[PDB]
Amino acid sequence: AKRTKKVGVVGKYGTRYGASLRKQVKKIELQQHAKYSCPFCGKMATKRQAVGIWKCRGCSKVMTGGAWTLQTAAAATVRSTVARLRKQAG
Amino acid sequence: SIKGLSLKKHLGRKQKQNRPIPPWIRMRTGSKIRYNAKRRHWRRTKLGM
Amino acid sequence: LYHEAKRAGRHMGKGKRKGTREARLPAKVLWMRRQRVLRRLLKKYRDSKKIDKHMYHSMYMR
Amino acid sequence: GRVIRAQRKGRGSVFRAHTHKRKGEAKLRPLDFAERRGYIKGLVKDILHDPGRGAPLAEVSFRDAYRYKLNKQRMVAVEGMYTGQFIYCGKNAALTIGNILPLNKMPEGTVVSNVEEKAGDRGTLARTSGTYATIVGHSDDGSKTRIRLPSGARKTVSGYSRGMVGIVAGGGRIDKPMLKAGNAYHKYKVKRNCWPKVRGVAMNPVEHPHGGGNHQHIGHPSTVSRMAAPGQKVGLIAARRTGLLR
Amino acid sequence: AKEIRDLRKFLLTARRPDAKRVTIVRQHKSTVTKFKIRCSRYLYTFVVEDREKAQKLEGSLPPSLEKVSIPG
Amino acid sequence: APRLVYRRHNHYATGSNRVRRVRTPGAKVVFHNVGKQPSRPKCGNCHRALPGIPAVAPHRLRLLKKRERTVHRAYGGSRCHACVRERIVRAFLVEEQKCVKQVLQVK
RNA sequence: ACCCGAAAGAUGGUGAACUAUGCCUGAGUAGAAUGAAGUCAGGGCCUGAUGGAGGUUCGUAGCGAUACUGACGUGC
RNA sequence: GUGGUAGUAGCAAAUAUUCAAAUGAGAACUUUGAAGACUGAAGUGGAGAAGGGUUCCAUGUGAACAGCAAUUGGACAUGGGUUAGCCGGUCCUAAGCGACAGCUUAACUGCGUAUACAGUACCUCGUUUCGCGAAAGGGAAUCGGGUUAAUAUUCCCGAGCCAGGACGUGGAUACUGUACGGUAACGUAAGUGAACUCCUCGACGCAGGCAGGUGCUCCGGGAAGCGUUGUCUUUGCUUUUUAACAGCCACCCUGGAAUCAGUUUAGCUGGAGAUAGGGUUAGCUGGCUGGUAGAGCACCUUGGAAGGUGUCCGGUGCGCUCCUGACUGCCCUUGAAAAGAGGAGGGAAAGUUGUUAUUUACACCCCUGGCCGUACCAAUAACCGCAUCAGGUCUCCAAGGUUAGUAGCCUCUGGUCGAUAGAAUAAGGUAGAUAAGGGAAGUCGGCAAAAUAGAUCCGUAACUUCGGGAAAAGGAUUGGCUCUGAGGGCUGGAACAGCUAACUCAGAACUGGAGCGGACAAGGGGAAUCCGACUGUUUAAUUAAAACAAAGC
């Protein structure tokens, strides 16, 4: 069975805090409790040890990342642009 | 109890000052002394030492 | 003597029970017994060479 | 009379910072010969949650140049930085994420974090989670350099000052709401005791300039001069402008 | 504390000159018996089950060694 | 029925004052202060526990013979062994690649 | 300045064993109710288990003190 | 200093005493017996801390004190009592705090991480400054039985261990240079390692269930003694114990996985090598022997303290307790340091077949272990509240029955009957019960008290932030006795044959003054309005709210 209609992971927080605030939490709480793919081994076993720290369970390696996802999109843009700036300098 | 040796001796001394005066002392000449003035009961009045 | 009677099942009426069914015997325990019983069965059948590798794993998950 | 809890905060005592289980002041490696005539290979050994901040600290293991021993600095970790990675500090290191170049070597448009105001400053600017300072443009020589700060403002800085290439980790940790008072409490326990703040209007007219009155109002302008003394300066200090922005 | 398991070692530990006494214990079940040499660090002890071997063994102990003690 | 009293000076429920109910030749039930459970040597940089070498509190590591405190290998006392293979396969190859260049640098 | 009488002022010291708050290091808190994500099966997203989240609820010890405007009010 | 008030108010919480004999001038009150009660293991029990300071123990007693009494006493008097290498302090560092260099100030004070702080003679190294700060943090090593009027892990008997320092006899190893074995994981009676460096232990959160273990509780057989006996009862109860210390019982190899397989209660694991087969290693508070029956315990017979037998063999569990282990989850919370012990990398030194030289934890043997605390109370009488005050004050252990239950109710071990008594039973009180008919008409106001209450099965609205409301509302059943069905484990190879262990559900028959959650325990409900969103906080001793805080803005 699916055992709630909508609220999902945030049935936890019950009948309080207000539904707009509760939804903001739902979408990024869904991110952080996810497993992500490891860069280094491949296996999708990465968990968030602490805000800004992620550990690949199978691999044993730890790496830095976002608060609530492995790769923040701003940081993905910098990895693109610094690879470009290195190439044109030669 | 878990006292230091200093505090043991201060306690020790004030046992030895808590006894009735000798009987023979009053008998001696020119003495107005009657029963010891400084006697203390361990409940009634306290040391802090 | 009271217990001898209890084995008989007496004094086990609805009136006697003053605790919720879950409190008296948890479903978590009744789950565990069963699931340990059935897993045991399959391992001794597989080591006997009645049940196959492939049939074992299907029965396990059901 | 009576001193306001604004004024009591400088006195020290009970408003000091809770430093005890914090794991060392985070810094860049102190300006060597090796860093300014070439480069020095670090190795990232650990990544650590320092309490009372959003950023991770990388713990980095350099070889000493002069003695046999092995040194250990703790930086603020740029994100995309892993346990086993070589960092390369110094002048003639590549422009890649991790590495600590001087600003004059970085070609403009580069994102930088943990930047030194002066030369050999050890690293003051853009250290908080998610932030960066972007390079705008150089001098003709390469002596001085423009930077754009996380505020907005534009800062002239010496080119022989340095910083880490890339964004500081723990990015975007304000987009959640703390739902509970409890989650605010656990935040400010491992920093100073700044919480919970009482509204000055609730107080009596002893304790605060706003407080008092049979209705709960402020009663003079909330806006106050720069020139006002200790214990006048409450509410909106030296304010150019008030009300909702646009 | 310690045991001995064979007759090679038990003859050495008796002859060793700091061995004080040999208390000897006997108990009915059948007649299983213990020798115990109180030496200096440890009390060594040697279980024998047969009585007729143990009677022979008491002769093999030296006379210049001091004590013997028995229950009964 | 029978209930017991702490024997040592510490009458609190800390780590150090961990205790173990025994019964005696008296038929009398009584504590013994067994200490804290010793962590066995997790050793780097893997941080796996080492085979061969027992959990003791670290002063009693004195009592043991030298044999017992190690493994007879290279880096045996403090290494994973598996980790050790890494050390050799590095230091073999990183010498060989460094050597192959320095013969090619004669030209 | 006939005798007795203030509310106060100032100078220099003594206190956080009670209480207010921060820090360091220790200790403590039955048994029930409700059943969030995750997972497994069967059916065409539903149904059944599994699971054990919460500044959740009932309620011991412990912390507290609403009502009777009860007793007591030259009191224990 | 002394009256009237006045022999008056009053001595009424914590269920409770009674009978006999002894002692004494004198007994409602002391002691001993016999009965009867209470406390009811989150005890009024057994031990510590703070605080107290001789109250501890014995013998004695004329007052006063112990709100009646007193032959009694925490009172009074005269004596006696506290034994440590291992129990603590001592040592380390935490938050912090004193001082050095200096810097301020008339000083008093205030600040204080600044500085020139090993191989007679010859070199070569050299960055941190001294100290205080935990009798719950860290940390060298101890356990059994006995013993005194009062002390015990401290005395005695026995069995060990640790720190420092070491002779000796007998073994290992090397003597052109520090042991061997195994494919490996690693191993064995031993198996050198300076400077310098790196690492490990010390060293760490909370919640959740799961598995295993100690102790407790429990059921049955055997052997002792005991109890009951008008009646029945192969019966009911007590004892049947084993210390520290010491020895022994995740990872590697072969191999190569999809028709994916292994696996937990839960998920996870696997070509960065799974299942399987064979190894290695970790361990607990596991098993066996030593310690160890000589002790302890339970009984029996001769003395007027001597000598004996017995101490055996098995189960059970979502049980209660503390501990370990590996897991799972939670955090804008990620959960001390230092002393000290050890490992490794390094290869400095020595050693030429004998008085050598490495072994001072290879085995055995030998010597020494200072200083201070140590009695007792720890509270309805040893502390603080002026007091032997219905108040307050940190920690540990924690039995049986009923039950979900450390709830309430009754009980065993341990403890207690300490709280002035006797007689009468008016009004008025204090607490506690019950009331025909009516049912808020009382009152500012349903204030007070009633009524509801457990479990099972059925059923459940408006509204809603879809999570809730909800135990909504509204109903039916429950005892005893006699049965029936369903649910496991271990043995020999279509599933059969033997042996056997749980308290848990479902249903039926019969029976009763229609009772049965029979005592205890245990929501009254519903419809609306105002304020605050919620949990949280507050005027110690008249105000807990609508006030403060709160997340969000």
Return the ∠ at Cα A10 (arms to A5 and A16), rounded to 5°.
100
Q: Is A84 left (phi over 0), alpha (psi -120 to 50) or beta?
A: alpha
D235 backbone dihedrals φ, ψ, rounded to 5°: 75, -140
Helix (H) or strand (E) run with residue F100 in it: helix F82-104
A52 contacts in chain D (CB < 8 Å): 49, 54-56, 77, 79, 129, 169-171, 173
For the record, the structure tokens of E14 come out as 């008796």
Q: F81, exposed or middle or buried, with CB in 10 Å at 0-12, 13-18, 19+? A: middle
Residues 6+ positions from D41 with CB-CB distance below 8 Å: D62, D63, D86, D87, D88
Select from D111, D138, D183 the residue whose CB has the most chain A CBs within 10 Å, as the one to mutate to test that interface: D111
Surface of A (35-74) touching D: CB under 8 A: 39-40, 49-53, 61-68, 72, 74
Is F23:F30 a contact under the CB 8 Å cutoff?
A: yes
Q: Whole-angstrom Cα distance, residue F11 to residue F9?
A: 6
* Quoted resolution (Å): 3.2
Distance A71 CA to G34 C1' (A): 38
Residues of D near A (CB-CB distance < 8 A)?
46-47, 49, 54-56, 58, 77-84, 94-97, 107, 109-111, 129-130, 132, 165-167, 169-173, 175-177, 179
d(CA D145, CA D138): 4
d(CA B11, CA D232): 59
D92 Cβ contact partners less than 8 Å away, ≥ 6 residues apart: D38, D39
DSSP D33-56: HHHHSSEEE--EEEEEE-TTSSSE
Cα distance between residue C25 and residue D197, in whole Å: 50
Residues 6 or more apart whose Cβ sits within 8 Å of residue D174: none
Taking CB atoms and an 8 Å limit, are D173 and A62 in contact across chains?
no
- Spacing of C44 CA from H215 C1' in Å: 37
Question: Shortest CB distance from D176 goes to which of A28, A62, A88?
Answer: A28
CA distance A2 to chain D (A): 26
Q: Which two tokens stand for residue F99?
A: 């050597």
Give the nucleotide at minimum CA-to-C1' distance from F60.
Answer: H341
Chain E 15-44 residues in 7 Å CB range of strand H: 16, 18, 23, 25, 27-28, 34, 36, 38-43
Distance from the Cα of residue D60 to its chain's centroid: 20
Residue D163's DSSP bridge partners are: D101
Contact D94, D88 (CB under 8 A): yes
Of A28, A53, A82, the CB nearest to D95: A82
Please tell me the total number of residues recorded for chain C in this structure: 62
Closest chain D residue by Cα to residue A88: D107
Residue D54 CA to its chain's centroid (Å): 10
Pick the residue of A22, A60, A82 with the most D CBs within 10 A to test the interface with D by mutation: A82
Query: Distance (Å) from the C-alpha of residue D48 to the closest C-alpha of chain A?
Result: 8
What is the DSSP code string of D113-144? ESB-SSTT----BS-STT--EEEEEE-SSSSE
Rounded to whole angstroms, how far apart are CA atoms E19 and E13? Answer: 7
Per 3-state DSSP, chain D is made up of helix, strand and coil in percentages (nearest 5) of 5, 25, 70
CA-closest candidate to residue D79, choices D167, D13, D9: D167
Q: Which ranges constitute the DSSP H helices of chain B? A: 5-16, 23-27
Q: Between helices C27-48 and C53-61, what is the axis angle to 10°?
A: 170
Total residues belonging to chain F = 107
User: Look-up: residue for tokens 């006292």?
Assistant: B3
Nearest to C34 by CA among C24, C25, C46: C25
Q: What's D8's DSSP letter?
A: G
Query: In this structure, what DSSP letter does residue D98 have?
Result: T
Instruction: Output phi, psi for D188, to 5 deg.
Output: -90, 0
Strand H-proximal residues of F, range 72-101, CB below 7 A, are 72-79, 81-82
Interchain proximity D175–A74, CB inside 8 Å: no
Q: Which nucleotides of H are covered by protein (CB under 7 A)?
A: 41, 45-55, 74-78, 87-88, 94-96, 126, 135-141, 143-146, 153, 158-163, 179-182, 184-193, 196-204, 209-211, 214-217, 239-247, 250-252, 259-266, 268-270, 272, 280-285, 289-297, 308, 310, 318, 322-325, 329-336, 340-345, 361-362, 364-366, 372-378, 382-384, 387-388, 395-399, 401-405, 412-413, 454-457, 465-468, 477-485, 487-490, 495, 503-507, 516-518, 533-536, 547-553
The helix or strand, by DSSP H or E, that contains position E26, with its residue range, turns out to be: strand E21-27
Instruction: State how far the Cα of D16 lies from the Cα of D9, in Å rounded to an integer.
Output: 8
Residue D226 · residue D238 · CB < 8 Å: yes
The token pair at C29 is 């325990």
CA dist D175 and A18 (Å) reads: 16
Residues D28/D73, Cβ–Cβ less than 8 Å = yes
| Segment holding F30, helix H or strand E | strand F29-32
